[PDB]
Design a protein around this ligand. Structure first.
Ligand SMILES: [Ca+2]
Lengths: 47, 283
């Protein structure tokens, strides 16, 4: 979501294109990991 | 431990009860409501359907742990390979990493419950307040708490009809539900975290391979991503979405540097320490 860091040749722009995707991947993956819980699903749905 | 007994009970509740219910999931910036239909078949297999009730019609159907179908919005970042369920919830070893204690009684969704505190034995993970249904052992309410005891997320049933098996019509999905080793390691993990998956993906923006590692302690999970920098001087980054932290740290290497991103439902410090500890495998 809101990517945060500043002023050292490391644009948020570089991070912006990546971080949200990686975040989504972790959450979604947790959702389909086979756990009996509805909670990982809920987290993924919240995105 | 009676607390251990409750956890054991929670662990098998899924296979011993058929039910329907509605629940809320809330975190900073998100409030959503969902429906669940769960039937234990005559052979003991679990068939379950989850449906988002507000906003878009997100949905998943699972049959004995496998995802039968899943809405697009829930799976855009999953390759079919990733469709594996790594594991079954096992509470047996959880006591090593968390202190389990019954702390009271409550009433949730009109049902009596016992309150189980799941307290971290260290600073590397988050605790839970679990309200377990007396009749079935199902989790009526789950609160994820940070170090300061602050609420990171709320999962709570508003209505739960137990015993009763959902009809076949209810288990059926809508059309929105779509029918469906890496050379890196961590030199530090918090106690009880273990590698659950390892795979390669492509960078979202360049042709580069990105290494993916997933770790879990039985309750919490974090994922690690290692992406080549090709000599770019990119600095660190941080984010948070409810209980999920994101930390990115540059790793100096002999191959142009790498960006190491750690994402998970763990404290910021833990993610940061892990990110700093990722190393390439050596010849
Ligand atoms: Ca189970």
């Amino acid at each position: 979501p809101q990517v945060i860091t500043n002023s050292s040749s490391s644009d948020t722009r570089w991070h912006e294109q990546r971080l949200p995707i990686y975040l989504r991947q972790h959450v979604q993956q947790s959702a389909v990991s086979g756990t009996e819980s509805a909670l990982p699903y809920a987290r993924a749905a919240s995105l | 431990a009676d607390a251990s007994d409750w956890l054991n009970r929670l662990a098998e509740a899924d296979r011993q009860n058929s039910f329907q219910g509605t629940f809320v999931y809330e975190r900073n910036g998100s409030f959503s409501t969902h429906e669940i239909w769960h039937r234990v078949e005559s052979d003991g297999a679990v068939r379950e359907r989850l449906l988002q009730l507000d906003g878009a019609r997100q949905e998943v159907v699972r049959v004995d742990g496998r995802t039968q179908c899943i809405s697009g919005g829930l799976a855009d970042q999953l390759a079919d390979a990733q469709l594996w369920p790594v594991r079954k919830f096992d509470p047996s070893q959880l006591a090593s990493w968390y202190d389990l204690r019954l702390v009271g009684e409550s009433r949730v969704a009109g049902r009596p419950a016992v309150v189980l505190a799941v307290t971290p034995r260290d600073q590397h993970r988050y605790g839970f307040e679990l309200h377990l249904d007396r009749d079935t052992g199902l989790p009526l309410k789950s609160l994820l708490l940070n170090e300061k005891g602050q609420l990171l997320e709320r999962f709570q049933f508003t209505q739960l009809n137990t015993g009763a098996a959902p009809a076949e019509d209810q288990l059926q999905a809508g059309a929105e539900c779509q029918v469906v080793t890496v050379a890196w390691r961590s030199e530090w993990l918090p106690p009880g975290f273990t590698l659950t998956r390892s795979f390669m993906r492509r960078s979202p923006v360049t042709p580069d391979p990105v290494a993916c590692l997933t770790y879990g302690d039985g309750l919490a999970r974090f994922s690690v991503f290692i992406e080549p920098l090709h000599g770019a001087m990119v600095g660190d980054a941080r984010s948070q979405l409810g209980p999920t932290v994101v930390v990115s740290k540059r790793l100096q290497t002999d191959d142009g540097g790498q960006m190491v991103t750690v994402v998970g439902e763990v404290p910021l410090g833990t993610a940061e320490r892990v990110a700093l500890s990722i190393r390439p495998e050596a010849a």
